[PDB]
C-alpha cells in the first residue's frame, strides 16, 4: 500500500477550498509528479464523495495525449491523494493572464487539442462539464493537458441527460441555467468560452454578481472585435449558440461538427492526436523543479474509507 511519506514535498503549486496541489518527488524513483491533496472532512461536509470518486475512476481507464495521466490514487484516515504528471507549463489561465490575448493561430492549436480530448471523452460516454482556463494546463513541450475530472458524469451518450447544477459560473451553458436537464453539448459551450477568451482577451460575459452573470449568459448577445476573422466569429457564434440543439457539436456527430468547421480548415485531426503538430509556445523551464509558470501567490508558501479509489498505474 502507498502512503504519504513515499514522497518529498517541494513546492505548493495551488491551494483552494477543497484542498491543495504540491510538486513532489517520488523517493523510490527520484521522479517528479504533482500531488493533489484533498481533505475528507471537507469533502464529506460538502457532500462531494461521488464526484471525488468519479474523478479517480474516470482517470483509471482513460488514456489520451491531452488528458493528465494518473500515476497513483491513494488515501489516509483523513486525506485523499492524487499523484499525476507535473504539467511544467502551468495553466493556460497563467499564460493568457500574462499575455492578455493569443493569436488566432495559437488559439487554433490549443482548441484542436481540446477538441481531440473532448471527442475521446464523449466517445467514452463521458461529459467533462468544467472546461476552463484553470483546468487546461501545458506539459513541458507545450501541449494541452486537461486537469480536474471531479465534475465528470459517466454513461452519457448521444441524447442522455444530466441533472446536477454544477460547473463554473462564468462557463455555465445557458440550458444549465434552466430547470430540468441538459446534455453533453455543455462541453462545446465550454470550449466556446475558452476559445472566446483566447482570441478576445475576456470572457464573453462577466459580472461578479452571479445573478447578473447568469442573466447575461441567457439573454445577452456576444460581441466580437472587428478585426476578428469571419471564420473565428463563425466558430465562436456556433460554439456559443445558446440553443444546444443548434450549437456546433450539439448534433449526433458530436465533435465531427466542430472538427469540420472552417476555422480548422488547416488542421489535420490525425496529426493532432498523434502529436505531430508543433506547439507555438514551448515552456522555457530550465530544470524539473522549475515552477516559473505558476504564481508566487502559491509557490512562496511553506508546506473512514473511500471505495473505488486506491489505484496504481503499474498494477492496472
Amino acid at each position: 500500500k502507498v502512503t504519504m511519506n513515499d514522497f518529498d514535498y517541494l513546492k505548493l503549486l495551488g491551494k483552494g477550498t477543497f484542498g491543495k496541489v504540491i510538486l513532489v518527488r517520488e523517493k523510490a524513483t527520484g521522479r517528479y509528479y504533482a500531488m493533489k491533496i484533498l481533505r475528507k472532512e471537507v469533502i464529506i461536509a460538502k457532500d462531494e464523495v461521488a464526484h471525488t470518486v468519479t474523478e479517480s475512476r474516470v482517470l483509471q481507464n482513460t488514456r489520451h495525449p491531452f488528458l493528465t495521466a494518473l500515476k497513483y490514487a491513494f488515501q489516509t484516515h483523513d486525506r485523499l491523494c492524487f499523484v499525476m504528471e507535473y504539467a511544467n507549463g502551468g495553466e493556460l489561465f497563467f499564460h493568457l493572464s500574462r499575455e492578455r490575448v493569443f493569436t488566432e493561430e495559437r488559439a487554433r492549436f490549443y482548441g484542436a487539442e481540446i477538441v481531440s480530448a473532448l471527442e475521446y471523452l464523449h466517445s467514452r460516454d463521458v461529459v467533462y462539464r468544467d472546461i476552463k482556463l484553470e483546468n487546461l494546463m501545458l506539459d513541458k513541450d507545450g501541449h494541452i493537458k486537461i486537469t480536474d475530472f471531479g465534475l465528470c458524469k459517466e454513461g452519457i451518450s448521444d441524447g442522455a441527460t444530466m441533472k446536477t447544477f454544477c460547473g463554473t459560473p462564468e462557463y455555465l451553458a445557458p440550458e444549465v441555467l434552466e430547470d430540468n436537464d441538459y446534455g453533453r453539448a455543455v462541453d462545446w459551450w465550454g470550449l466556446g468560452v475558452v476559445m472566446y477568451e483566447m482570441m478576445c482577451g475576456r470572457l464573453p460575459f462577466y459580472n461578479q454578481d452571479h445573478e447578473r452573470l447568469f442573466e447575461l449568459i441567457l439573454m445577452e448577445e456576444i460581441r466580437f472585435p472587428r478585426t476578428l476573422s469571419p471564420e473565428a466569429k463563425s466558430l465562436l457564434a456556433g460554439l456559443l449558440k445558446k440553443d444546444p440543439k443548434q450549437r456546433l457539436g450539439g448534433g449526433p456527430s458530436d465533435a465531427k461538427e466542430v472538427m469540420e468547421h472552417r476555422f480548422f480548415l488547416s488542421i489535420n485531426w490525425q496529426d493532432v492526436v498523434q502529436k505531430k503538430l508543433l506547439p507555438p509556445f514551448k515552456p522555457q523551464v530550465t530544470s524539473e523543479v522549475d515552477t516559473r509558470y505558476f504564481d508566487d501567490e502559491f509557490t512562496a508558501q511553506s508546506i473512514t474509507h473511500f471505495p473505488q479509489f486506491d489505484y496504481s498505474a503499474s498494477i492496472r
Binding site: 483552494g16 477550498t17 460538502k46 457532500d47 462531494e48 464526484h51 489561465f93 493572464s97 492578455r100 468544467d130 476552463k132 484553470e134 480536474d148 471531479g150 465534475l151 446536477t164 447544477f165 454544477c166 460547473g167 463554473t168 459560473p169 462564468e170 462557463y171 475576456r202 470572457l203 462577466y206 461578479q208
Partner: peptide, 10 residues
C-alpha cells in the same frame, strides 16, 4: 485578467 474562477456542485 479576470479573477480565479471556482468550480462548484449543487
Amino acid at each position: 485578467g479576470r479573477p480565479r474562477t471556482t468550480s462548484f456542485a449543487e
